[PDB]
């Protein structure tokens, strides 16, 4: 019926890119750069946040089936965004994506697009579609962050701070392979959980079951803390590696 789009962390040691000689650090760097390229390009074009995320998910899934050494990442990114726009009904003309990609990429980087940027991108759509197995509908942590936050009742301002901080963690998680490891529902809970610790908030008190200390279980069944804490560790590693710090 429908494909499985989730892998184990251990399995990322055997992506095609790795087995062609790329090191773990480099592939993740390429993944961050490609995702952020998609994010920046689409943001300049005024694209909805779902459209950016869908392209990023297409991108991350793509490179579980292909090597970065054979598919230049910014071309792939541009193609994913191009298709994402059609899928999510926020369409853009390919020429306009190229124009924006040229604005944001230096001369070396834009070299990936070759002599005819639009063609390199349009040609890839065929491979993109076969690779994503025509499973075009994608759900993202955002909708669950809001669906679950609507069921919290209490201090309007403490909850809005929780949501905004968690939303930033969702945006930051798009640079990682978490999209490939956990369902979006789990990602939304994990980011709520992280913001709670960072905001020193006890979310159970906002739930309909205030003496249920594992507050998320009434949103996402069968999720151990093991998972939510692995996800938090991966999100905060992003901040520690960089110069950036937690939003608070």
């Amino acid at each position: 019926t429908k494909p499985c789009w989730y892998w184990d962390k251990k399995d990322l040691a055997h992506t095609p890119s790795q087995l062609e000689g790329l090191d773990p650090a480099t592939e993740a760097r390429y993944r961050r750069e490609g995702a952020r390229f998609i994010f920046d390009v689409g943001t300049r074009l005024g694209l909805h946040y779902d459209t950016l995320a869908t392209g990023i998910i297409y991108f991350h899934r793509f490179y579980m089936f292909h090597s970065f050494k054979q598919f230049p990442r910014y071309v792939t990114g541009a193609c994913c965004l191009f298709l994402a726009g059609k899928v999510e009904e926020t369409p853009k003309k390919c020429k306009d994506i190229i124009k924006t990609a040229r604005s944001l990429l230096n001369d070396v980087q834009f070299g990936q697009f070759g002599d005819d940027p639009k063609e390199e991108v349009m040609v890839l759509e065929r491979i993109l579609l076969q690779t994503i197995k025509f499973d075009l509908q994608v759900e993202h942590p955002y909708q669950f962050l809001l669906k679950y936050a609507k069921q919290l009742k209490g201090d309007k301002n403490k909850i809005q701070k929780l949501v905004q901080m968690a939303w930033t963690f969702v945006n930051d998680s798009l640079c990682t392979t978490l999209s490939l490891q956990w369902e979006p529902e789990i990602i939304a809970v994990a980011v709520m959980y992280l913001a709670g610790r960072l905001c020193k908030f006890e979310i159970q008190e906002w739930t309909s079951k205030p003496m249920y200390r594992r507050w998320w279980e009434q949103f996402v069944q069968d999720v151990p803390v093991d998972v939510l804490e692995d996800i938090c560790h991966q999100i905060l590693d992003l901040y520690s590696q960089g110069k950036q710090q937690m939003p608070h």
Binding site: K2, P91, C94, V123, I127, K133, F134
Partner: protein
Amino acid sequence: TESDWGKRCVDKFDIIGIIGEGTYGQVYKAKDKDTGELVALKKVRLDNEKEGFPITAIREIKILRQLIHRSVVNMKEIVTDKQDALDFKKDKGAFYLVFEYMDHDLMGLLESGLVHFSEDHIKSFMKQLMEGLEYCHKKNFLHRDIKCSNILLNNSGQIKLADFGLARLYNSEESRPYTNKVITLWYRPPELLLGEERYTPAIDVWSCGCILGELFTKKPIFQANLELAQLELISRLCGSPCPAVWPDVIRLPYFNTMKPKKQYRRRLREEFSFIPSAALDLLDHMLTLDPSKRCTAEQTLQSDFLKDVELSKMAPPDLPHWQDCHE
């Protein structure tokens, strides 16, 4: 696995012939070589590559892999032409969207004059159509192109809704700017003839009410060539749009522009007095001018006409295939 679409080749189907001109390609009848099942193949041509894979086809893939209903057409797989070996840039081969083959389409059966519907045949039809539309509406999808030609019917009496090339998600909380001209003029609701642009799922209800009327006469109800003439015909039957019956008609772009000849009174019950009472009430409620007063799909399924219709007793319409040769 069954889920790895886009790889299997169209070699796996014996093409029987062309059954229609589509929007994004030609549509073919074919037989599966392995199972013997008859399929319908919708061809997607990306060779034009003006904007790549057509969005119309993307809508149908995105939506029809989510929707599971006995009255919603089923996409089985997507297959491809023989791909060029080790040369993906040259590869211009097409994709084919695989559907079940349905014996007929409602237009062809009605245009050829080869169908007759009893009240009980119309009950079986409308219960399926509305149940299918309700499934879609509960999932927040608008069909936006409900015409007789997009209702497929196979000889067992089963109805299936078909072309989702204009289907988009509807958000009640967030009003979204949509395309002004979506439904074929004959089945277009009055709200869109005035250019709503933010329409409700009630647009689909109007079309089906138009079909409900057509099944009782075998002739479409509102046949016009131009948007103004259409509003006139609807007005002659349903009454002219005016704040008395549609308080928000004054907010619509073309309300002052597209006035009908008169401020007509509603005669729907008079001109359809030959229709059974239970059905006439459904038509009157489905062909309500104000989309916020026009009944929902669910409300039709909880009507005297369709509520107690049983799907086990499908009563296939009277499609005669003998004595047609010699009268």
